[PDB]
Design a protein around this ligand. Structure first.
Ligand SMILES: N[C@@H](CCC(=O)N[C@@H](CS)C(=O)NCC(=O)O)C(=O)O
Ligand SMILES: N[C@@H](CCC(=O)N[C@@H](CS)C(=O)NCC(=O)O)C(=O)O
Ligand SMILES: O=C(O)/C(O)=C/C=C/C(=O)c1ccccc1
Ligand SMILES: O=C(O)/C(O)=C/C=C/C(=O)c1ccccc1
Lengths: 200, 200
């Protein structure tokens, strides 16, 4: 099993998930520019859209999109309880949060990283983010994790996205529950092992 | 079961899925400007983020995010095969496609429907879409649907987002396989019933 990744990128979410699952896998780094792997192979042969993550199975079969990948990972080690059982209502609730993180958080961070983007663009996105962060913050007043008392792959994804705040000049202090969350997920061994393996 | 919708918005996706599934439900229109439902209820009481779709279950529980909703819907009628079975590889592959449509397609249409979006934002997004729609056109070149020969809720979601192109002046002429896909899906009785039901 292979995870195509780039240090600090959103591929850190499946990376943390794999560790939390206690699975073994190979990291393959990708040059996000020439779209070539560390071993000099063409990545657009693996993922046509040219982004990370991509999970490749022993099979040769592949999966892209974080929310899909992290669900595949969790379902390999149900004992770890990293996602609700499929067919339970809480699994749809997991998927809801995964899509929220991806479409409402992650995609809003994207143009803040972009040097080309105007200041009128960035400021509109920053206002939307503040609002969406407020919503996530309120959720994390109810319980230490997005779905309650057990860590799920949705918390892992959220931890990764929130960790980008430092690079786009977002202070998380206005939301005590988001800082409490960061701290709580930040100090897990699997998470640390993942940051270490990525040089962070 | 209630579906909160706005005519022609992304909620048309669960709408079509519900009809494909043959399920009983009540459409509840939402004024996206004033954020009031048809009954005059404050819609933020229902979805804290303020957007459609939202699925309200018989028992009062709610689900947001298109990709979560359409999976719940499909899982209600497994005989109809609107999604591959949970735990199968092809179900992760559906979630990949659903997250792709949401984060890579839908979210890039969003600024185009905005008057207050700068022409810089719009030009960038149109370019992202040109590339991303190319990837989907290639996917739909030698197979009728996203997952192969079987229509799924991913195809329904794609069909709805593609339908937005006329309203924001996106020409799909460079992608004949996408127009072919539109005619393949748009010709289904549940799709045409939903269009009619939304007053379109
Ligand atoms: N929709 C994709 C987005 C993946 C994505 O935005 N990956 C970024 C890193 S966080 C990337 O590889 N860079 C963008 C690119 O070069 O295309 C997903 O959720 O997996
Ligand atoms: N992340 C949400 C996005 C939903 C969404 O962007 N809905 C739009 C219509 S397509 C909407 O209700 N408009 C936003 C608003 O009215 O403020 C999802 O995938 O369901
Ligand atoms: O969301 C995007 O468009 C995107 O490419 C995000 C990438 C983020 C990073 O690679 C990254 C690396 C180190 C630290 C923070 C962020
Ligand atoms: O993508 C969005 O965030 C968004 O607000 C999409 C809106 C879709 C529509 O309401 C719509 C309605 C009729 C025709 C085309 C589009």
């Amino acid at each position: 099993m292979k995870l195509y990744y780039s240090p600090g990128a959103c591929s850190l979410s499946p990376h943390i998930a794999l560790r939390e699952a206690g699975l073994n896998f190979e990291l393959v780094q990708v040059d996000l520019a020439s779209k070539k792997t560390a071993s000099g192979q063409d990545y657009l042969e693996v993922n046509p859209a040219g982004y990370v993550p991509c999970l490749q199975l022993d099979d040769g079969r592949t999966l892209t999109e974080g929310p899909a990948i992290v669900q595949y990972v969790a379902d390999q080690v149900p004992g770890k309880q990293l996602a609700p059982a499929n067919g339970s209502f809480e699994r749809y609730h997991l998927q809801q949060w995964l899509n929220f993180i991806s479409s409402e958080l992650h995609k809003s961070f994207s143009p803040l990283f972009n040097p080309a983007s105007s200041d009128e663009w960035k400021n509109a996105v920053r206002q939307s983010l503040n609002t969406r962060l407020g919503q996530v913050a309120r959720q994390l007043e109810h319980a230490p994790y997005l779905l309650g008392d057990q860590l799920s792959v949705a918390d892992i994804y959220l931890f990764v996205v929130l960790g980008w705040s430092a690079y786009v000049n977002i202070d998380l202090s206005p939301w005590p529950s988001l800082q409490a969350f960061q701290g709580r997920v930040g100090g897990r061994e699997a998470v640390q092992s993942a940051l270490r393996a990525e040089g962070l």
